[PDB]
Ligand binder design. Structure first.
Ligand code: CDL
Ligand code: PC1
Ligand code: 3PE
Ligand code: NDP
Ligand code: SF4
Ligand code: SF4
Ligand code: SF4
Ligand code: ZN
Lengths: 38, 94, 114, 290, 144, 94, 154, 378, 206, 176, 45
């Protein structure tokens, strides 16, 4: 019996992470540059 | 090559010594600063240069498999010795 | 947007479970304070319960709410059955934590962190 | 600042607070709270002790590796004082006894030892000196304890003009000789919490204004000694001539001196903590004097 | 054999050179067995063997009473055994250093040291590297 | 190994075993603590020819799983039924 | 007055170090080597160290293994219940400073965060002989105590 | 219902009615050290020593289980001499475990003397560990590819000398316990588990065979050279503590029987796979050959890469089926390593097994399961 | 070839046929069947099929997987359903093993397998404790390995190795306390992966 | 192949029944157990007289670490950092720079002996036999800080124990 | 030089016992009772 949930997925309250390490952190999403030595 | 700073603290073979205003030297009060007295840089300078009759020589540091990886050393330059990259022994061509 | 529910099919059902958990926590605090010989008052304990519920007051997902209630009931069971010791119960209050600076200048003086 | 004493970290156990403190009298009631608060934030604490090393063990867990350093000293030996303070940025004097012994009297412990520490510290170039005196210190007191405190306070101020002198009322806490004293059994007392006094000392080190000043550390409420002792018995559900004379000295009111509030500390009522101290000896709160 | 057992017990008193020597090893090592003297190191430790004894008790040392200025009549310590005898005593080899001496090196300690923990000679850790960031030093002459 | 004959008889009788033949303490039967040096053999890949690594490369012969069905006749069991165990003829019953 | 005090320290020091009754927190691997030090080859009992004693009769706590965060309050509770004099021997890398689990979210990085430690026995695990060396070292430490000498100089 | 709040350390929350146990609730995690998470930050070689420290009574058996899993994912095989050494030391490890299991099980219920006799035997077996690896317990000796070093000369003679006398030491232990009416009163009809309950509750090893189930992984899913040695599998009939005790004693005898065959059939040759992209080359080769030095350098820094995949590998460890679910993402560090400890399911069965028994029987039942909390908590 | 693990075609063929057998019988739930090069059969199913698929494998006469060897989870953050639930079953009758895999996310419950295997009880508690996967109709779901009041699920890939808090004894409050973690020596992250491909057989399409 | 450990029917004839009755009433198996502990009383004990006697060890024994030299006195360590990379406990910390004579040498070499698991992986990884686990195991300390070894401590251990370490390596290197 | 490795002696090791050996001792139940009754009778007389 499925239910309809239109809200955005937000799991911050159930991950156990302290607040300072959610709001004040800046994640970088990238593909690492090739190591120029190789 | 153990020498003491003006404060009297021994300088290590890495050149370490707490400076005059460093609180951290309080850890040695009532105790002692561990310093190894056999400075390798001085001891390897005591070994004589080895005279060989070839342009290229090999070194394994002695003791065969108890030494270091075998490397071959070029002796063409006449203004300097060939030094082993592992053990520091020196070679010169006749 | 069609998902499997945990317990509650909508937020109205979920808020019923939230309020029931709050009542259970509310009534347990006097027994917790006595049983663990806590040096906080019952008012301090109930204030902490209220604080913990209110930091999640913004959630709108009934599945998330369900999980907070599931976890909240686990914590209650740990307290009521005295699986927790005094140190665990007192961890909510952070007594040995020196107050962290909030305003810009105080943070600027002490380090680089925001 | 020398690069090794620049603060780093987040004020935790493995952080670097920048404080290098020699704490004399660290093996007593007040010392453990002071050493604990210093170690909490990653300070370098030098602990000169007269006692057995066994009696210093409770201090070891209070700091990260290397942060608590122990030394031997004698109150009468200035060389042992010099070794303890020569590398420090602040010196904290918590030396005291509540009775006299065949080897040390109140003059030795409250006058000569503090004077020796202040003088050696000044010669060694220590920047901050924190001296604990007493609120009721007075050359005219019937207590020889309080007479010696007055002389020592004067001698320390002359020796190390920039000393911070703290004058607490009787301190209540788990290891006190105050609430425990009554529980093991005309005058107004204003007792102050152990943790508030510690916070006051810690903030005194950080505050550049505290240098050269005398503080009075008093609790928020004044009580009749009778009200207090009855309240102690109610909460608990149940010595020398000099000690009795101090308990019977009314706690001075000194408006001209700054207090815990001036150092950012909010005084803690006796009613919140009486249970914490007296639960082991085991209620209408004692009326105050407005 | 009850007589032969007692004779051996009496021989142990003689084997330790009289009653005083017998009682000295009894109170220092709690053991009065007589063994063959394998050798003695420069610190005064003496090393014995008896191959009739079971593996583990067939080799032992009687510690010197004085080592590096410390009275060791009653305070003996396992770290007092120097490395060249350590190999033989723990049965890492069958050859005592008297028969197979160690190779000589100029940097090898001539004088062994025992565990120095808790003494003024104890090891105290520290960072062996030099300062990494050099601060700017302001000029000593005014010109603001 | 040094018990008197009377004591050996007493402990053998009390245990009902001949303890002297299987002493739990070790004496001279154990191997010497100094041994002659070994000369260990080399493995099958120690060859100067007919030894290319691509002919003996186990990791590179590993393949991804075979997919028998993706959502993109007789019955069978996962293997034949296990055969019944036989009783030990050494000692079927303790 | 001073000869007497020195002799009385010697007596009480001798009695306490000659009669060291351990409570073993056999937390993990290191407890196995502790059992081997009780086993016949080393026989800790021959030194006056009883095989096992209850905490209320214990003079020394041997912390033999990893101390998890979950277990820390219980270990502190046992230590607080020991009558004095009481000593703690930290046995093995885990108890010494966390060892192989030092970076774990669930492990106390050294038991000396919870209780004061008198002796640290290195190894993973220390050999039964290494633990016995540690115990004998603690005996030597007790022998250096001067409780009555310091008492009478107060 | 009186509530009581109380190998490693365990917290038992029990409910009693008079002498009886209504409910046993084991509270574990007192030795949980996040081993499975830590392994994700290690190379495959760096992770191996964690397996010594799970069931820290059966170190090399745990090493063997991990090695076999890694060898399977690598698609290599260890050389025959290494396989025989692994079975040889696997059975020596079995003896170490059953001594610990049986005598501490006896010691916990008051029979303390066999512990001392048999721990002198364990002390000699630690010497075998130390002579091949330099460590008495955490040998880190069995590795993916084979073993680290060859047997020192003279070691097999000393193992023969040890094995020749061991069964007499077993006989002495049986003289203390097997027919002792007090011992039988503490174990007979205690903690009976049916064959069907044993399978459904996830039991393995002696917890299955005590109930008559004819299952042993060394016989049915053999690994290394276990198909080349002869031995019998002890089988109980009553499913109680006493039959499991008899199964363990008889398994020690069969281990001696296997050890005897391993000594006689030990083949010559190398002891780690002759593949220098997996197993490091000899030190002499590393110091003369360029290829050997490169491979040594890379094997000790990056480590060998493992082809991507997942395996569940299991062995008949002394305590029961010990396995790993090992996931490789293709790199030189495992992506996930779930450890299957037989004691985990066995302890989960304590509540079921304790029903209708007294408080002191709980001591016997925990002992008959052979619980070490290093493997239970990981 | 002495250094190469030999193949076993017989087992591979037998497991492949049984994989097709299970798929033909339970098409409602079976999404993928694969057999590894080392002959381990994996059944991938929709999560709704946990109880029917496990029940079938336990009780069917051609399956008889009476023993649950292990039940665990794997966290793969890049998947929409980050959690892979893995059941490893053993059949003594046919001397064979099988692996059943399904999936879920942070908010979607899975059905407790306790009715099928009593062994599943603690495995599901551990999965809940270490990953935060909720199992519906579990008799007593709660933490099992972590400390009381511990926040987070440590085996998730984004949970830090040393966690967020650490414990010490504080003398002022006379109890153990928890505080934000500070490390004297930070764990040193290593980048070990070679920039050269090792296994061409597993190359992913571009 | 299997065997039954406890599948036997007692004989119910009168002689067998009286034998069991005699055992029950006269405690015969218990008396037999007393014989066994009595026999041990008269056995020589297995205890060795530590520290005057020591447990046997082999050349492979993994004990306290030490840094070694060449016969000339030059350090063997060349700061390759292979030990630091392989260390399962991350117990090794290394820094290096060109020495004043241009040689490749360490300026930091720390081993946290309370992180170390004494696994010996570092001495396997070292290409020049610089870092070893020596034969010492009697180095317990009164403080935690004394077990945080720096390069000076480790070089002194090498100079202290080299005589034994060289002999042990000689005995076992042909196995490596 | 020839390969030298830890190996069993040529012909293998001697036999190793493993089967339980709990030897039978003592008298029959009849004899034990007969001695006990006999002792009682002598004591009574
Ligand atoms: C019971 C009392 C029996 C007294 C007999 C003592 C004796 O001679 O035994 C040693 C002697 C050797 O026994 P072992 O086991 O073969 O010794 C191994 C080596 O052969 C031994 O060879 P070894 O090379 O090792 O010999 C060296 C050893 C030399 O060994 C000896 O000489 C042993 C000396 C023991 C003499 C004690 C006589 C008894 C005095 C009675 C006082 C105590 C009871 C009250 O040197 C020593 O260590 C002597 C140091 C002094 C030991 C302290 C003994 C003092 C005891 C009296 C306390 C007074 C204060 O025993 C025998 O030869 C057998 C006959 C002795 C009678 C045995 C009766 C057994 C008890 C009946 C069964 C009841 C059980 C219930
Ligand atoms: C009732 C009075 C009992 C008096 C007990 C006498 C103590 C005897 C004694 O000290 O043992 C010798 C001990 C022997 O020294 P030890 O205890 O260090 O032992 C050394 C030998 N090993 C290495 C085997 C342990 O003497 C002393 O240690 C000095 C303490 C003297 C205490 C007496 C004070 C009076
Ligand atoms: C002519 C006409 C004459 C008329 C009189 C004739 C009478 C003589 C014949 C009868 C002899 C009676 C024997 C008396 C001894 C008591 C017997 C007894 O009670 O033993 C049975 C008891 C329980 O036995 P169990 O097998 O567990 O179960 C049976 C019950 N369902 O089992 C036990 O008690 C076990 C013992 C427990 C203690 C164990 C610890 C010590 C054991 C060793 C002690 C050694 C002997 C001590 C001797 C002391 C000397 C002072
Ligand atoms: N506690 C209170 O109620 C109040 C306290 N104060 C002041 O606070 C300070 C400390 O308070 P408190 O902690 O209660 O004092 P304690 O008596 O509790 O401890 C005092 C310290 O002084 C040391 N000490 C005492 N005599 C000597 C000596 N002769 N030589 C060397 N060291 C010595 C002791 O060391 P050891 O352990 O070696 O004896 C101890 O560490 C004192 O100056 C006291 O006057 C002021 C007002 C009220
Ligand atoms: S220090 Fe080593 S042996 Fe001891 S508990 Fe920790 S991992 Fe196990
Ligand atoms: S022995 Fe192992 S844990 Fe210790 S420093 Fe060497 S590699 Fe690291
Ligand atoms: S000790 Fe050896 S492995 Fe470690 S950095 Fe030095 S040379 Fe390299
Ligand atoms: Zn060279």
């Amino acid at each position: 019996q499925l239910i309809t949930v239109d809200e955005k997925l937000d799991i911050t309250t159930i991950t156990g992470v302290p607040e300072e390490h959610i709001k004040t952190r800046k994640a970088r999403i990238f593909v690492p540059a090739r190591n120029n030595m190789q | 090559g153990v020498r003491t700073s003006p404060t009297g603290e021994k300088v290590t073979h890495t050149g370490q010594v707490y400076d005059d205003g460093d609180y951290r030297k309080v850890r040695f009060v009532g105790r002692q600063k561990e310093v190894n007295e056999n400075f390798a840089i001085d001891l390897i300078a005591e070994q004589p240069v080895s005279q060989v009759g070839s342009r290229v020589i090999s070194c394994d540091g002695g003791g065969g498999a108890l030494g270091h990886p075998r490397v071959y050393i070029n002796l063409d330059k006449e203004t300097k010795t060939g030094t082993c990259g592992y053990c520091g022994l020196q070679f010169r061509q006749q | 947007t069609s998902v499997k529910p945990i317990f509650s099919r909508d937020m109205n059902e979920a808020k019923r479970r939230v309020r029931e958990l709050y009542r259970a926590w509310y009534r347990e605090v006097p027994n917790t304070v006595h049983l663990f010989q806590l040096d906080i008052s019952v008012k301090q304990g109930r204030d902490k319960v209220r604080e913990m519920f209110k930091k999640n007051a913004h959630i709108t997902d009934p599945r998330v709410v369900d999980l907070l209630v599931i976890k909240g009931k686990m914590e209650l069971e740990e307290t009521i059955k005295v699986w927790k010791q005094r140190t665990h119960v007192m961890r909510f209050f952070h007594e040995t934590e020196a107050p962290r600076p909030k305003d810009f200048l105080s943070k600027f003086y002490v380090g680089h962190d925001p | 600042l020398h690069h090794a004493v620049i603060p780093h970290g987040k004020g935790g156990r493995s952080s670097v607070s920048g404080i290098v403190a020699t704490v004399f009298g660290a093996t007593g009631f007040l010392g453990r709270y002071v050493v604990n608060h210093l170690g909490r934030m990653g300070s370098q604490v030098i602990v000169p002790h007269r006692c057995e090393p066994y009696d210093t063990m409770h201090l070891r867990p209070m700091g990260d590796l290397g942060q608590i350093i122990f030394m031997d000293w004698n109150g009468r030996d200035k060389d042992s004082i010099r070794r303890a303070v020569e590398h420090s940025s602040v010196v904290i004097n918590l030396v005291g006894r509540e009775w006299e012994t065949q080897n040390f009297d109140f003059e030795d412990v409250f006058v000569k030892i503090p004077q020796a520490i202040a003088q050696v510290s000044k010669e060694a170039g220590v920047e901050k000196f924190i001296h604990i005196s007493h609120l009721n210190a007075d050359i005219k007191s019937s207590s020889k304890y309080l007479r010696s405190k007055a002389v020592g306070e004067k001698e320390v101020r002359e020796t190390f003009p920039e000393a911070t002198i703290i004058k607490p009322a009787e301190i209540f806490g788990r290891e006190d000789r105050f609430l425990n004293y009554f529980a093991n059994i005309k005058t107004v007392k204003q007792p102050v919490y152990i943790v508030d006094v510690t916070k006051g000392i810690i903030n005194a080190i950080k505050d550049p204004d505290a240098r050269g000043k005398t503080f009075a550390f008093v609790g928020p409420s004044r009580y009749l000694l009778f009200d207090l002792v009855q309240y102690v018995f109610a909460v608990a559900h149940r010595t020398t001539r000099d000690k009795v004379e101090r308990i019977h000295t009314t706690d001075k009111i000194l408006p001209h001196l700054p207090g815990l509030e001036d150092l950012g500390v909010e005084a803690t009522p006796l009613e919140l903590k009486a249970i914490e101290v007296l639960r082991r000896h085991r209620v209408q709160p004692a009326k105050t004097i407005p | 054999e009850l007589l032969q057992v007692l004779k051996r017990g009496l021989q142990q008193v003689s084997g330790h050179g009289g009653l005083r020597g017998y009682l000295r090893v009894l109170f220092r090592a709690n053991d009065v067995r007589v063994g063959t003297l394998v050798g003695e190191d420069k610190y005064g430790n003496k090393y014995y063997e008896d191959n009739k004894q079971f593996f583990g008790r067939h080799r032992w040392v009687i510690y010197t009473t004085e080592m590096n200025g410390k009275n060791t009549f009653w305070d003996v310590d396992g770290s007092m055994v120097p490395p060249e005898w350590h190999r033989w005593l723990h049965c890492m080899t069958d050859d005592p250093p008297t028969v197979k001496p160690p190779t000589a090196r100029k940097f090898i300690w001539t004088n062994h040291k025992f565990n120095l923990s808790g003494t003024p000679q104890q090891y105290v850790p520290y960072s062996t590297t030099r300062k990494k960031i050099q601060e700017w030093v302001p000029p000593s002459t005014p010109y603001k | 190994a040094s018990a008197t004959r009377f004591i050996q008889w007493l402990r053998n009788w009390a245990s009902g075993r001949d303890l002297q033949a299987k002493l739990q303490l070790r004496y001279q039967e154990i191997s010497k603590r100094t041994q002659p040096p070994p000369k260990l053999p080399v493995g099958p890949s120690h060859k100067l020819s007919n030894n290319y690594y691509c002919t003996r490369d186990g990791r590179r012969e590993a393949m991804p799983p075979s997919i028998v069905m993706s959502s993109q006749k007789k019955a069978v069991s996962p293997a034949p039924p296990i055969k019944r165990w036989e009783l030990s003829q050494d000692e079927p019953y303790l | 007055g001073e000869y007497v005090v020195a002799k009385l320290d010697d007596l009480i020091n001798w009695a306490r170090r000659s009669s060291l009754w351990p409570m073993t927190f056999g937390l993990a691997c290191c407890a196995v080597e502790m059992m081997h030090m009780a086993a016949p080859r080393y026989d800790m009992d021959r030194f006056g160290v009883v095989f096992r004693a209850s905490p209320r009769q214990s003079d020394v706590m041997i912390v033999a293994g990893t101390l998890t965060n979950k277990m820390a309050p219980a270990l502190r509770k046992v230590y607080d219940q020991m009558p004095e004099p009481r000593y703690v021997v930290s046995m093995g890398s885990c108890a010494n400073g966390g060892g192989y689990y030092h970076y774990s979210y669930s492990v106390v990085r050294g038991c000396d965060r919870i209780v004061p430690v008198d002796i640290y026995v290195p190894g993973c695990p220390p050999t039964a002989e290494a633990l016995l060396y540690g115990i004998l070292q603690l005996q030597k430490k007790i022998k250096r105590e001067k409780r009555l000498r310091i008492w009478y100089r107060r | 219902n009186l509530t009581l709040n109380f190998h490693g350390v365990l917290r038992l929350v029990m409910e009693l009615s008079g002498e009886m146990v209504r409910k046993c609730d084991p509270h574990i995690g007192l030795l949980h050290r996040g081993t499975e998470k830590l392994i994700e930050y290690k190379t495959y070689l760096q992770a191996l020593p964690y397996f010594d420290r799970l069931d820290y009574v059966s170190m090399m058996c745990n090493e063997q289980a991990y090695s076999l899993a890694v060898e399977k994912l690598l698609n290599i095989r260890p050389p025959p001499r290494a396989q025989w050494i692994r079975v040889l030391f696997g059975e020596i490890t079995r003896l170490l475990n059953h001594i610990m299991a049986v005598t501490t099980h006896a010691l916990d219920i008051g029979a303390m003397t066999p512990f001392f006799w048999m721990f002198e035997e364990r002390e000699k077996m630690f010497e075998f560990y130390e002579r091949v690896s330099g460590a008495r317990m955490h040998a880190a000796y069995v590795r993916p590819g084979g073993v680290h070093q060859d047997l020192p000369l003279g070691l097999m003679d000393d193992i023969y000398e040890f094995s020749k006398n061991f069964s007499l030491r077993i006989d002495e232990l049986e003289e203390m316990l097997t027919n002792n009416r007090i011992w039988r009163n503490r174990t007979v009809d205690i903690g009976i588990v049916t064959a069907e309950d044993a399978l459904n509750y996830g039991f393995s090893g002696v917890m299955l065979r005590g109930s008559g189930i004819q299952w042993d992984l060394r016989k049915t899913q053999p690994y290394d050279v276990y198909d080349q040695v002869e031995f019998d599998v002890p089988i109980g009939s009553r499913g109680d503590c006493y039959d499991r005790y008899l199964c363990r004693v008889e398994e020690m005898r069969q281990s001696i029987r296997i050890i005897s065959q391993c000594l006689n059939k030990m083949p010559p040759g190398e002891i780690k796979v002759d593949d220098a992209k997996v197993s490091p080359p000899k030190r002499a080769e590393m110091k003369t050959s360029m290829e050997s030095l490169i491979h040594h350098f890379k094997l000790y820094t990056e480590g060998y890469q493992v082809p991507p995949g997942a395996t569940y590998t299991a062995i008949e460890a002394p305590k029961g089926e010990f396995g790993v679910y090992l996931v490789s993402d293709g790199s030189s560090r495992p992506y996930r390593c779930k450890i299957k400890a037989p004691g985990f399911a066995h302890l989960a069965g304590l509540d079921k097994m304790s029903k209708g028994h007294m408080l002191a029987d709980v001591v016997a039942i925990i002992g008959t399961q052979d619980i070490v909390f290093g493997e239970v908590d990981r | 070839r002495p250094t190469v693990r030999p193949r076993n075609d017989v087992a591979h063929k037998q497991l492949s046929a049984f994989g097709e057998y299970v798929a033909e019988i339970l098409p409602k739930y079976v999404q993928q069947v694969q057999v590894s090069c080392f002959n381990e059969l994996e059944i991938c199913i929709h999560p709704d099929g946990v109880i029917p698929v496990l029940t079938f494998l336990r009780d069917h006469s051609n399956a008889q997987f009476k023993s649950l060897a292990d039940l665990t989870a794997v966290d793969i953050p890049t998947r929409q359903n980050r959690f892979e639930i893995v059941y490893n079953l053993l059949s003594l009758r046919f001397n064979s093993r099988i692996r059943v895999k399904t999936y879920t996310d942070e908010l979607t419950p899975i059905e407790s397998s306790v009715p099928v295997y009593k062994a599943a009880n603690w495995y599901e508690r551990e999965i809940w404790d270490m990953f935060g996967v909720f199992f519906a109709n579990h008799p007593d779901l709660r933490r099992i390995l972590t400390d009381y009041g511990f926040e987070g699920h440590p085996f998730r890939k984004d949970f830090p190795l040393s966690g967020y808090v650490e414990l010490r004894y504080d003398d002022e409050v006379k109890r153990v306390v928890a505080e934000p973690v500070e490390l004297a020596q930070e764990f040193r992250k290593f980048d070990l992966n070679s920039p050269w491909e090792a296994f061409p057989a597993y190359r992913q399409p571009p | 192949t299997y065997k039954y450990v406890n599948l036997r029917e007692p004989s119910m004839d009168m002689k067998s029944v009286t034998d069991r009755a005699a055992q029950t009433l006269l405690w015969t198996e218990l008396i037999r157990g007393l014989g066994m502990t009595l026999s041990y009383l008269f056995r020589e004990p297995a205890t060795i007289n530590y520290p005057f006697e020591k447990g046997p060890l082999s050349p492979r024994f993994r004990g306290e670490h030490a840094l070694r030299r060449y016969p000339s006195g030059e350090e063997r360590c060349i700061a390759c950092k292979l030990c630091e990379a392989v260390c399962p406990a991350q117990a090794i910390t290394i820094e290096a720079e060109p020495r004043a004579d241009g040689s490749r040498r360490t300026t930091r070499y720390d081993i946290d002996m309370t992180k170390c698991i004494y696994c010996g992986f570092c001495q396997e990884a070292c290409p020049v036999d610089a870092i070893v686990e020596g034969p010492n195991f009697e180095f317990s300390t009164e403080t935690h800080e004394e077990l945080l070894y720096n390069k000076e401590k480790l070089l002194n251990n090498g100079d202290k124990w080299e005589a034994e370490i060289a002999a042990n390596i000689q005995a076992d290197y042909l196995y490596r | 030089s020839k390969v030298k490795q830890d190996m069993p002696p040529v012909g293998g090791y001697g036999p190793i016992d493993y089967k339980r050996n709990l030897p039978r001792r003592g008298l029959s139940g009849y004899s034990m009772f007969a001695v006990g009754i006999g002792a009682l009778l002598f004591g009574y007389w």
